[PDB]
Scaffold this active site. Structure first.
Site, PDB file in Angstrom:
ATOM      1  CG  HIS A 312      -1.472   1.383   1.491  1.00 14.31           C
ATOM      2  ND1 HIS A 312      -2.430   1.998   0.715  1.00 14.31           N
ATOM      3  CD2 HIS A 312      -1.170   2.252   2.481  1.00 14.31           C
ATOM      4  CE1 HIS A 312      -2.698   3.187   1.224  1.00 14.31           C
ATOM      5  NE2 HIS A 312      -1.948   3.365   2.294  1.00 14.31           N
ATOM      6  NE  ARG A 334     -10.089   7.683  -3.881  1.00 15.29           N
ATOM      7  CZ  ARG A 334     -10.123   7.205  -2.643  1.00 15.29           C
ATOM      8  NH1 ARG A 334     -10.507   5.954  -2.424  1.00 15.29           N
ATOM      9  NH2 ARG A 334      -9.773   7.975  -1.619  1.00 15.29           N
ATOM     10  CG  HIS A 345      -6.687 -11.421  -7.651  1.00 16.30           C
ATOM     11  ND1 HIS A 345      -6.864 -12.770  -7.859  1.00 16.30           N
ATOM     12  CD2 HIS A 345      -7.372 -11.119  -6.525  1.00 16.30           C
ATOM     13  CE1 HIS A 345      -7.616 -13.264  -6.893  1.00 16.30           C
ATOM     14  NE2 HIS A 345      -7.939 -12.284  -6.072  1.00 16.30           N
TER      15      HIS A 345
HETATM   16  C1  LIG Z   1      -3.287 -28.414  -5.804  1.00 15.56           C
HETATM   17  C2  LIG Z   1      -2.855 -27.199  -6.509  1.00 15.56           C
HETATM   18  C3  LIG Z   1      -2.600 -26.086  -5.592  1.00 15.56           C
HETATM   19  C4  LIG Z   1      -1.507 -25.198  -6.074  1.00 15.56           C
HETATM   20  C5  LIG Z   1      -1.494 -23.820  -5.477  1.00 15.56           C
HETATM   21  C6  LIG Z   1      -2.102 -22.780  -6.360  1.00 15.56           C
HETATM   22  C7  LIG Z   1      -1.382 -21.479  -6.327  1.00 15.56           C
HETATM   23  C8  LIG Z   1      -2.275 -20.295  -6.555  1.00 15.56           C
HETATM   24  C9  LIG Z   1      -3.180 -19.981  -5.419  1.00 15.56           C
HETATM   25  C10 LIG Z   1      -3.125 -18.949  -4.600  1.00 15.56           C
HETATM   26  C11 LIG Z   1      -2.115 -17.848  -4.575  1.00 15.56           C
HETATM   27  C12 LIG Z   1      -2.630 -16.472  -4.201  1.00 15.56           C
HETATM   28  C13 LIG Z   1      -2.899 -15.576  -5.359  1.00 15.56           C
HETATM   29  C14 LIG Z   1      -3.856 -14.448  -5.071  1.00 15.56           C
HETATM   30  C15 LIG Z   1      -3.556 -13.635  -3.842  1.00 15.56           C
HETATM   31  C16 LIG Z   1      -4.406 -12.388  -3.698  1.00 15.56           C
HETATM   32  C17 LIG Z   1      -4.052 -11.331  -4.737  1.00 15.56           C
HETATM   33  C18 LIG Z   1      -4.508  -9.918  -4.512  1.00 15.56           C
HETATM   34  O1  LIG Z   1      -5.549  -9.625  -4.041  1.00 15.56           O
HETATM   35  S1  LIG Z   1      -3.345  -8.743  -4.980  1.00 15.56           S
HETATM   36  C19 LIG Z   1      -3.079  -7.830  -3.445  1.00 15.56           C
HETATM   37  C20 LIG Z   1      -3.861  -6.537  -3.482  1.00 15.56           C
HETATM   38  N1  LIG Z   1      -3.320  -5.442  -2.696  1.00 15.56           N
HETATM   39  C21 LIG Z   1      -3.729  -4.216  -2.971  1.00 15.56           C
HETATM   40  O2  LIG Z   1      -4.451  -3.984  -3.927  1.00 15.56           O
HETATM   41  C22 LIG Z   1      -3.359  -3.105  -2.047  1.00 15.56           C
HETATM   42  C23 LIG Z   1      -4.392  -2.039  -2.154  1.00 15.56           C
HETATM   43  N2  LIG Z   1      -3.852  -0.722  -1.916  1.00 15.56           N
HETATM   44  C24 LIG Z   1      -4.646   0.323  -1.920  1.00 15.56           C
HETATM   45  O3  LIG Z   1      -5.824   0.212  -2.126  1.00 15.56           O
HETATM   46  C25 LIG Z   1      -4.018   1.671  -1.681  1.00 15.56           C
HETATM   47  O4  LIG Z   1      -3.429   1.684  -0.396  1.00 15.56           O
HETATM   48  C26 LIG Z   1      -4.762   2.993  -1.999  1.00 15.56           C
HETATM   49  C27 LIG Z   1      -4.397   3.474  -3.398  1.00 15.56           C
HETATM   50  C28 LIG Z   1      -6.273   2.837  -1.911  1.00 15.56           C
HETATM   51  C29 LIG Z   1      -4.353   4.073  -1.011  1.00 15.56           C
HETATM   52  O5  LIG Z   1      -5.305   5.129  -1.033  1.00 15.56           O
HETATM   53  P1  LIG Z   1      -6.225   5.440   0.115  1.00 15.56           P
HETATM   54  O6  LIG Z   1      -6.972   4.342   0.721  1.00 15.56           O
HETATM   55  O7  LIG Z   1      -5.676   6.461   1.013  1.00 15.56           O
HETATM   56  O8  LIG Z   1      -7.063   6.238  -0.957  1.00 15.56           O
HETATM   57  P2  LIG Z   1      -6.923   7.796  -1.177  1.00 15.56           P
HETATM   58  O9  LIG Z   1      -8.148   8.496  -0.862  1.00 15.56           O
HETATM   59  O10 LIG Z   1      -6.353   8.039  -2.533  1.00 15.56           O
HETATM   60  O11 LIG Z   1      -5.856   8.293  -0.189  1.00 15.56           O
HETATM   61  C30 LIG Z   1      -5.086   9.435  -0.589  1.00 15.56           C
HETATM   62  C31 LIG Z   1      -5.409  10.647   0.244  1.00 15.56           C
HETATM   63  O12 LIG Z   1      -6.745  10.559   0.771  1.00 15.56           O
HETATM   64  C32 LIG Z   1      -6.855  11.371   1.924  1.00 15.56           C
HETATM   65  N3  LIG Z   1      -7.663  10.636   2.910  1.00 15.56           N
HETATM   66  C33 LIG Z   1      -7.920   9.291   2.870  1.00 15.56           C
HETATM   67  N4  LIG Z   1      -8.457   8.815   3.968  1.00 15.56           N
HETATM   68  C34 LIG Z   1      -8.575   9.929   4.784  1.00 15.56           C
HETATM   69  C35 LIG Z   1      -9.007  10.088   6.113  1.00 15.56           C
HETATM   70  N5  LIG Z   1      -9.397   9.081   6.900  1.00 15.56           N
HETATM   71  N6  LIG Z   1      -9.009  11.337   6.624  1.00 15.56           N
HETATM   72  C36 LIG Z   1      -8.619  12.352   5.851  1.00 15.56           C
HETATM   73  N7  LIG Z   1      -8.162  12.317   4.599  1.00 15.56           N
HETATM   74  C37 LIG Z   1      -8.139  11.067   4.127  1.00 15.56           C
HETATM   75  C38 LIG Z   1      -5.404  11.736   2.372  1.00 15.56           C
HETATM   76  O13 LIG Z   1      -5.062  13.112   2.237  1.00 15.56           O
HETATM   77  C39 LIG Z   1      -4.533  10.860   1.463  1.00 15.56           C
HETATM   78  O14 LIG Z   1      -3.323  11.538   1.041  1.00 15.56           O
HETATM   79  P3  LIG Z   1      -1.764  10.963   0.772  1.00 15.56           P
HETATM   80  O15 LIG Z   1      -1.539  11.066  -0.727  1.00 15.56           O
HETATM   81  O16 LIG Z   1      -1.744   9.599   1.330  1.00 15.56           O
HETATM   82  O17 LIG Z   1      -0.710  11.849   1.465  1.00 15.56           O
END
Ligand SMILES: CCCCCCCC/C=C\CCCCCCCC(=O)SCCNC(=O)CCNC(=O)[C@H](O)C(C)(C)COP(=O)(O)OP(=O)(O)OC[C@H]1O[C@@H](n2cnc3c(N)ncnc32)[C@H](O)[C@@H]1OP(=O)(O)O
Ligand SMILES: CCCCCCCC/C=C/CCCCCCCC(=O)SCCNC(=O)CCNC(=O)[C@H](O)C(C)(C)COP(=O)(O)OP(=O)(O)OC[C@H]1O[C@@H](n2cnc3c(N)ncnc32)[C@H](O)[C@@H]1OP(=O)(O)O
Ligand SMILES: CCCCCCCC/C=C/CCCCCCCC(=O)O[C@H](COC(=O)CCCCCCCCCCCCCCC)COP(=O)(O)OCCN
Ligand SMILES: CCCCCCCC/C=C\CCCCCCCC(=O)O[C@H](COC(=O)CCCCCCCCCCCCCCC)COP(=O)(O)OCCN
Ligand SMILES: CCCCCCCC/C=C\CCCCCCCC(=O)O[C@H](COC(=O)CCCCCCCCCCCCCCC)COP(=O)(O)OCCN
Ligand SMILES: CCCCCCCC/C=C\CCCCCCCC(=O)O[C@H](COC(=O)CCCCCCCCCCCCCCC)COP(=O)(O)OCCN
EC number: 2.3.1.20
Lengths: 411, 411
Positions: A312, A334, A345
């Site tokens: 993240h 986003r 994924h």
């Molecule tokens: C028998 C056979 C078996 C064999 C085995 C088989 C093998 C296979 C099997 C299995 C293997 C596994 C395979 C799959 C595994 C899973 C895969 C996945 O799922 S991939 C992972 C996904 N990870 C992500 O996607 C991370 C996600 N990251 C995010 O979402 C970000 O952190 C993101 C972009 C959302 C961050 O943003 P924000 O949440 O803050 O969103 P915003 O609003 O843009 O934040 C920016 C600004 O918003 C304001 N803001 C936000 N919240 C606020 C608040 N509470 N108060 C005030 N302001 C706020 C702040 O000013 C902030 O600013 P500032 O730029 O940081 O300085």
């Protein structure tokens, strides 16, 4: 006179008490798991404690490199991990004007993704859990080399501008382009490069031993889970999801939604805490903030940012803030992060198993219709229950489907 | 310039991070329990939701008072609960000089204990879980009438001394000796009397409904526990502990130490939170501090003071501080509280089942050899594991023994 002894307060478990000091529900979990598996684990650590030849397998791999192609790919990753360092050393001083250096970085970063996604598909002798250990390395290496490009470019432009005008080993720009620290970066448990990482004082053999025991216990625990609880439930009806109806699918999923969730929780604690702390301990790292409290996440948008902090804070610095600085339409950003997450994924779960049903894409898409819903209706200790339900019947199900349809088609 | 993004911190689960914000491991417990029992509960609330005649049983009890002697004793408790109030009203003004009043209080308090301990023993037609609901009432009434004596005596001596020389309904001394507030005291969820208790603004039908559902869910859950998990394990070997050897006892106990601990945890949450909050809600009470965080209790001496806060702040005010003020040898007082606790233990668990093996006395005695041990060696998140183990193989076992030896001798 009367001085009262009954104040006006609330029970510690109650919703409106604001206590939040339950470190000890956690130790109850540990104590119960240990009391229930602390004989099977001591027996399995013996029956597999001397019958794994942890020194003969490397010699058997040296006996043939083209067999076992998965470690072949993992070691091949060094070709890119060195080409990128060579581009950096090239444009470090005078060669390879920023245009050529940037295009070379783009080409190398693209081939990091496109090379194993081709090898593991064409080459037949590769195993799924061995293909995953090459893709989950060639994406970590890609994410690391992205920031290794970006940090160095930013610092180098800064030195170029400072050309228009300390003691505590704070490495300046050009002196950080040695092989040693590049390799230390690659193995470090973080995806965001930075000159002169923090460091921890010592190695703490005790802590390393405890983390190794946590790994060896939790892998054994979830192997017990997969074998006892979930394989019988599957082979009671070996009908693959690819043809079953949307009415039988759910009937069969409810019999796995809980064991699946349990092995996913065990994956998290085994990987994002124990393994990463073992790594960050051996190579004295010191940062060790790999997750915030994603459990008490009153809304799903807060859960998406607090499990897996490395990814993240990599997004927020190399994908989000750069593409808001020289851009706008934050909602488009986003969307961009959602799309990149969907790509990784459907690249990590679908390529090793050679399935392309695009189920995990529907799983990632149906999060926003769920995100807005949970954030709109539920609040507080019921929004947390909404998130905990989303983590049971939500995304991990969309990987259980793949692994089920694969185990069924082969056993 | 460089402004670093990697601080020097610790993982949230780690021992030396001091996080303690796990409200959400708790909601995971609730969500899992509900997903696993939210069909059996909706079926049992129907099959027993109209087949319990909750209005005909009171008429069947009115049809015969001498049958069903347990509610007979419970209603008989009002004889003492009124005799004590009559002594108070007597010496409230001029009668019954403090000597006679104190002796009458001692006699009445002694008969509160000695009357049911005789009725439930001699009278044969009484049931064990119906004898317990008379003893756990005649000890609560005794503990309440003790403080009802003490508070009034203290305030009355204070008025006697103030005789040697407001608006917000703060009831003064003599105006609190009405029947209404005595009864409100008896049903109030506290053992320490106090003029003008705190109050809560409203009744909050929502909260009362949630607590009633918690009771109806957890009793059903632990009936499932007792029936499925623990009765089979017992009647696989119906050999009573009274003759088995100290080597077979433990072999058979390890098969019950976990289900026992689980039903004890469910007793705690069903009783000290849900039932007492329902009571304290109906009669607007407002204090509602019935337990501190006994779970994260790094040492057992801290656990002994934070579960069941009512009893502990009754001790600390009517048994401990009075007997340190006009006395000394604080260790003798700690011994006195241990002995009183053992008496009420061996009076509530041994009298209804008519057993007097004095096992629970060994259980209470072996706590100090365990208390000093845990407080001496373990510290922190391992002292908490020591306490959590003591709560599994420690005292609750010494009640499981009684109930096992009783269920075996009768079925
Ligand atoms: C028998 C056979 C078996 C064999 C085995 C088989 C093998 C296979 C099997 C299995 C293997 C596994 C395979 C799959 C595994 C899973 C895969 C996945 O799922 S991939 C992972 C996904 N990870 C992500 O996607 C991370 C996600 N990251 C995010 O979402 C970000 O952190 C993101 C972009 C959302 C961050 O943003 P924000 O949440 O803050 O969103 P915003 O609003 O843009 O934040 C920016 C600004 O918003 C304001 N803001 C936000 N919240 C606020 C608040 N509470 N108060 C005030 N302001 C706020 C702040 O000013 C902030 O600013 P500032 O730029 O940081 O300085
Ligand atoms: C058909 C089949 C069958 C059918 C079914 C049939 C079923 C039938 C059976 C059904 C089963 C029924 C089974 C029933 C089982 C349950 C019965 C029981 O066992 S009931 C037990 C009750 N136990 C208690 O309530 C705890 C005992 N009491 C306490 O813990 C007290 O709070 C007590 C007296 C120990 C308080 O002591 P301290 O923990 O405070 O310790 P100190 O050292 O004495 O403290 C005094 C002073 O010490 C200082 N101090 C203490 N801690 C300190 C600190 N951390 N820092 C600084 N100073 C400190 C302070 O200055 C304090 O002062 P300052 O008291 O205000 O004057
Ligand atoms: C149609 C089915 C309806 C539900 C029937 C089963 C549950 C009946 C009652 C169970 C006991 C719990 C009662 C509700 C929760 C009370 C406590 C609570 O607020 O829990 C809160 C967390 O729990 C919840 O929010 C649980 C809400 C229900 C989640 C699941 C609901 C949808 C699924 C139900 C049916 C599932 C069937 C599955 C079949 C395979 C916070 O806890 P606290 O700190 O103890 O709060 C104290 C009050 N401020
Ligand atoms: C009776 C028939 C048995 C059939 C064979 C199966 C036997 C094993 C079954 C179940 C064991 C796995 C169930 C728990 C899965 C979650 C594991 C877990 O705790 O994940 C945790 C990660 O997740 C979180 O932190 C957030 C959610 C935590 C929820 C609570 C998890 C523990 C539940 C324990 C259940 C009770 C004991 C079960 C066995 C008797 C890691 O916690 P930790 O290791 O306890 O704490 C670290 C302290 N340094
Ligand atoms: C007489 C026969 C003795 C047999 C040998 C003893 C039993 C060995 C059992 C298990 C060993 C493997 C344990 C794997 C998991 C270890 C996790 C661990 O060390 O957790 C640590 C915490 O440990 C605890 O909370 C409690 C650990 C001790 C539990 C009690 C174990 C001894 C008593 C039971 C032994 C017998 C069990 C079987 C009985 C039928 C680190 O905690 P953290 O909060 O995550 O982090 C702070 C520092 N980072
Ligand atoms: C998959 C089947 C369900 C397994 C669920 C995981 C294991 C149980 C989960 C959590 C236990 C955590 C124990 C912490 C102890 C702390 C002290 C304490 O009094 O805890 C409270 C009391 O804890 C409990 O009542 C839980 C005790 C363990 C109950 C185990 C019951 C197992 C039943 C399995 C049924 C399986 C299906 C059967 C079908 C016929 C926490 O309660 P709460 O309901 O979360 O209240 C919060 C309301 N906002």
């Amino acid at each position: 006179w009367e001085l009262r002894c009954h104040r006006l307060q609330d029970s510690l478990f109650s919703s409106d008490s604001g206590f939040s000091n339950y470190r000890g529900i956690l130790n109850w979990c540990v104590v119960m798991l240990i009391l229930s598996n602390a004989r099977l684990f001591l027996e399995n650590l013996i029956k597999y404690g001397i019958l794994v030849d942890p020194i003969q397998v490397v010699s058997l791999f040296l006996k043939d490199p083209y067999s076992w192609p998965a470690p072949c790919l993992v070691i091949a990753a060094n070709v890119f991990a060195v080409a990128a360092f060579q581009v950096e050393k090239r444009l470090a001083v005078g060669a390879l004007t920023e245009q050529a250096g940037l295009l070379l970085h783009v080409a190398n970063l693209a081939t990091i993704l496109c090379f194993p996604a081709a090898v593991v598909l064409l080459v037949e002798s590769i195993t799924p859990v061995g293909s995953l250990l090459a893709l989950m390395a060639h994406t970590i290496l890609f994410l690391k080399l992205f920031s290794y490009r970006d940090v160095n470019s930013w610092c180098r432009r800064a030195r170029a501008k400072a050309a228009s005008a300390a003691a505590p080993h704070t490495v300046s720009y050009p002196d950080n382009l040695t092989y040693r620290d590049l390799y230390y970066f690659l193995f470090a448990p973080t995806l965001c490069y930075e000159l002169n990482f923090p460091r921890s004082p010592r190695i703490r053999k005790r802590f390393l031993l405890r983390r190794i025991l946590e790994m060896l216990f939790f892998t054994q625990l979830q192997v017990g889970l997969i074998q006892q609880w979930m394989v019988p439930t599957i082979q009671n009806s070996m009908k693959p999801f690819k043809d079953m109806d949307y009415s039988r699918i759910i009937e069969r999923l409810l019999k796995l939604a809980v064991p699946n969730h349990l092995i996913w929780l065990i994956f998290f604690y085994w990987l994002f805490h124990s393994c990463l702390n073992a790594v960050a301990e051996l190579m004295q790292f010191g940062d060790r903030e790999f997750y915030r409290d994603w459990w008490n996440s009153e809304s799903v948008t807060y859960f998406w940012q607090n499990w897996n902090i490395p990814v993240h804070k990599w997004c927020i610095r190399h994908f989000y803030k750069p593409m808001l600085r020289r851009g706008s339409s934050k909602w488009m950003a986003r969307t961009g992060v959602f799309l990149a997450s969907a790509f990784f994924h459907e690249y990590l779960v679908s390529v090793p198993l050679r399935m392309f049903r695009l189920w995990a894409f529907t799983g990632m898409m149906a999060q926003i219709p769920l995100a807005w819903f949970v954030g709109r209706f539920f609040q507080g200790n019921y929004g947390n229950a909404a998130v905990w339900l989303s983590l049971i019947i939500g995304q991990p199900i969309a990987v259980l489907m793949y692994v089920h349809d694969y185990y069924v088609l082969n056993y």
